[PDB]
Amino acid sequence: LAQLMEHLETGQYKKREKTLAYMTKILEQGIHEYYKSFDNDTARKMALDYFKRINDDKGMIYMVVVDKNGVVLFDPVNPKTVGQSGLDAQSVDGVYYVRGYLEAAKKGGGYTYYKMPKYDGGVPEKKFAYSHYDEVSQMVIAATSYYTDINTENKAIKEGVNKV
Amino acid sequence: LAQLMEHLETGQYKKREKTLAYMTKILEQGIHEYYKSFDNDTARKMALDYFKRINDDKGMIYMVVVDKNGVVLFDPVNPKTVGQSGLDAQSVDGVYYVRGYLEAAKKGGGYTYYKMPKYDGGVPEKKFAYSHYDEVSQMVIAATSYYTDINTENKAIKEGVNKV
């Protein structure tokens, strides 16, 4: 029962990793409508306003955005970092999370693992980010999820297995 | 082991139902950015062009869109239905799928279950749709998934369970 639960949990995390790669692709395709039809500055504002709305939904994912040089463009958990280089930014568990975003994007997309609150001033939680360089917007876009949330979403599945 | 696999599969389908409701909300939030700026015809063309790209991704979800009266706005699987009333449209398994989209939307969002190909001229297979009426765009937007695809995504999890 314990081995099953472990493999099941790890499997759910791996599945969510793939989900984030897909959701990043469809979000990029969506913001491309902004870039095709509005000036650069307006399109970027629209993209970041949209991402605020996603984060405010407090659902499956939370966005983070940096430019190709590591300047933070969007991160409501850490608002004071916006407009600043994030190259020396560390999570509380010592991860250079922005460097992680950039390294993953340089490979064509990938993952960064670190702890962070869900909101500014909150308790830090383990999470992960899928990041990708969108060539239309010239932004490194990260879709992120918290392990606690993945567990919540999979709670009924877990309770059913326990029942059997 | 069989009862376990059954409860697991059902649980994964119920989880996907919730995912579709969330994805529909974030897609609505995305298209609103330009509904705010452009005339209805232009904004709708942009939204449906985006949805074409989502369906062309051949990933987790496929969109279908109807208006409040059941006129089909977007359905690449059934292109001849576009611009026509879909009120009498029936899936191969005898489901008035557009009526289902509308009934679900009238309740504030919900689900319709039916068989349909993945592409025009393909073999039909079982799927479900989450639909919701978006007041800004005045469209009944449906995010849909195929059970075969959910099973594919969950294959590694299934193979691990069999491992034990």
Q: Which candidate, B138, B122, B105, B126, places its Cα nearest to that of B21?
A: B105
CB contact under 8 A, B25 and A57: yes
Resolution for this model in angstroms, one decimal place?
A: 1.4
Looking at residue B122, its amino acid is G
**CA contacts within 13 A on the Cβ side of A161:** 21
CATH code for the domain in which residue B8 is found: 3.30.450.20
Q: Is B83 within 8 Å of B89 (Cβ atoms)?
A: no
Residue A154 sits at φ, ψ, to 5 deg, of -100, 10
How far is the alpha carbon of A164 from chain B, nearest alpha carbon, in Å? 6
Q: What is the helix (H) or strand (E) element at residue A112, kind and residue range? A: strand A110-116
Distance of alpha carbon B51 from alpha carbon B74, whole angstroms: 8
User: A161: which chain B residues are within 8 Å (Cβ-Cβ)?
Assistant: 4, 7-8
Domain of A37, in residue numbers: 1-164
As a whole number of Å, the end-to-end CA separation of chain A is 10
Distance of alpha carbon A134 from alpha carbon A143, whole angstroms: 13
User: A37: which chain B residues are within 8 Å (Cβ-Cβ)?
Assistant: 34, 38, 46
**CA contacts within 13 A on the Cβ side of B13:** 16
Distance of alpha carbon A67 from alpha carbon A81, whole angstroms: 13
CB contact under 8 A, A15 and B157: yes
Distance of alpha carbon B69 from alpha carbon A112, whole angstroms: 46
Q: Is B70 within 8 Å of B87 (Cβ atoms)?
A: yes
Distance of alpha carbon B33 from alpha carbon B43, whole angstroms: 9
Most B CBs within 10 Å, among A10, A12, A15, to test the B interface: A15
A138: region left, alpha or beta (phi > 0 left; psi from -120 to 50 alpha): left
- CB neighbours of B1 closer than 8 A, spacing ≥ 6? none
- Cβ–Cβ pairs < 8 A, chains A and B: 96
- Total structural domains in chain B? 1
Method used to obtain the model? X-ray
How far is the alpha carbon of A51 from chain B, nearest alpha carbon, in Å? 9
Q: Is A65 within 8 Å of A55 (Cβ atoms)?
A: no
Q: At what angle do helices B2-35 and A155-163 cross, to 10 degrees?
A: 170
Tokens at B58, concatenated: 């051949």
- CB neighbours of B2 closer than 8 A, spacing ≥ 6? none
Burial of B56 (0-12, 13-18, 19+ CB in 10 A): exposed
**CA contacts within 13 A on the Cβ side of A110:** 13
Distance of alpha carbon B150 from alpha carbon B14, whole angstroms: 11
Burial of A41 (0-12, 13-18, 19+ CB in 10 A): exposed
How far is the alpha carbon of A88 from chain B, nearest alpha carbon, in Å? 32
The length of chain A, given as a count of residues = 164
Between CA B93 and CA B98, with CA B97 as vertex, the angle to 5 degrees is: 155
